[PDB]
Amino acid sequence: ELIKENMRMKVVMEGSVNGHQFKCTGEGEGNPYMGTQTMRIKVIEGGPLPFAFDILATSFSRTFIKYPKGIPDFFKQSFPEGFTWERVTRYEDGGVVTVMQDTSLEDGCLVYHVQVRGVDFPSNGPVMQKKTKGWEPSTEMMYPADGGLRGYTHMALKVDGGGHLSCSFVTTYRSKKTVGNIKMPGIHAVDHRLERLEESDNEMFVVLREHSVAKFA
Ligand SMILES: [Mg+2]
Ligand SMILES: [Mg+2]
Ligand SMILES: [Mg+2]
């Protein structure tokens, strides 16, 4: 079918955080049925970023979730047309990030277009001071919502000196399927582990790896 055991992805991300304009490109691959993927990301405009790359990392891939056959896979069913996602992220101490994403399939490659707008991060907070240490593993609750899905995640951004910055994601996943059917899942959870590795000194190059597995709520 269209989502093969090996799939490539490409991403273009444009946005701003606290007025700082940037652009990133990414490419990678994974095993959509095993829920594993890796991607290589470059900051191509606005680099070096004067904020933590961690606030972008969660915007770089829902086709690579391991769904058990008993839980319908909204994302893989949405091809060939694909799906969109819209997110609002609220950070402890201020920091609101709004994200709009398109997922398409072009010549057998997944193609992502992402728009990111971050505002009101404190000037001497760990995001704008680049004192973050990556994301804890998290569980995203998935709910049926008017023929799409609502995702809800409480994430913990690790900070220098042992603390965390609490943050909350509400995501709306919408199908772009204009011909054909989608079997809607019930309430479920997705367990995520997002790792950054192979980073350059000023985060102009970052490798992300993700493990995403669906389970019953
Ligand atoms: Mg399915
Ligand atoms: Mg902060
Ligand atoms: Mg660098």
Residue numbers in the entry: 8 to 67, 71 to 227
Sentences from the paper on this structure:
The blue form of mRubyFT reached its maximum at 5.7 h and completely transformed into the red form that had a maturation half-time of 15 h. The mRubyFT timer was a monomer both on PAGE and FPLC. The mRubyFT had six mutations relative to the original mRuby2 template.
To determine why mRubyFT has the blue-to-red timer properties on the molecular level and to elucidate the impact of mutations introduced during directed molecular evolution, we determined the mRubyFT crystal structure using X-ray at 1.5 Å resolution. In the crystal, mRubyFT has one protein chain per asymmetric unit, and a contact analysis revealed that the protein is a monomer at pH > 5.5, i.e., in a highly fluorescent red state. The mRubyFT chromophore formed by 68LYG70 (corresponding to 65LYG67 in the alignment) amino acids is positioned on the central helix of the β-barrel. The structure of mRubyFT demonstrates a clear electron density for a cis-isomer of the red 2-(iminomethyl)-4- (4-hydroxybenzylidene)-imidazol-5-one chromophore with coplanar geometry of imidazolic and phenolic rings. The chromophore is stabilized by four direct hydrogen bonds (H-bonds) to R72, W95, R97, and S148, and five water-mediated H-bonds to S66, Q111, T113, E146, and L204. The negative charge of the phenolic hydroxyl group of the chromophore is maintained by H202 that is stacked with the phenolic group of the chromophore. The N148S mutation in mRubyFT is favorable for the stabilization of the cis-isomer due to the strong hydrogen bond (2.4 Å) of the S148 OH-group with the phenolic hydroxyl group of the chromophore. Compared to the mRuby structure, the A222S mutation in mRubyFT resulted in the formation of two additional H-bonds of S222 with H202 and E220 (corresponding to E222 in the alignment, and E222 in EGFP). Therefore, the introduction into mRubyFT of the negatively charged D130 and positively charged R229 with a large side chain instead of N130 (N125 in eqFP611) and L229 (L224 in eqfp611), respectively, must stabilize the monomeric state and perturb potential AC and AD interfaces. In addition, based on the crystal structure data, the chromophore in mRubyFT lacks any signs of degradation and has a single cis-configuration stabilized by the N148S mutation.
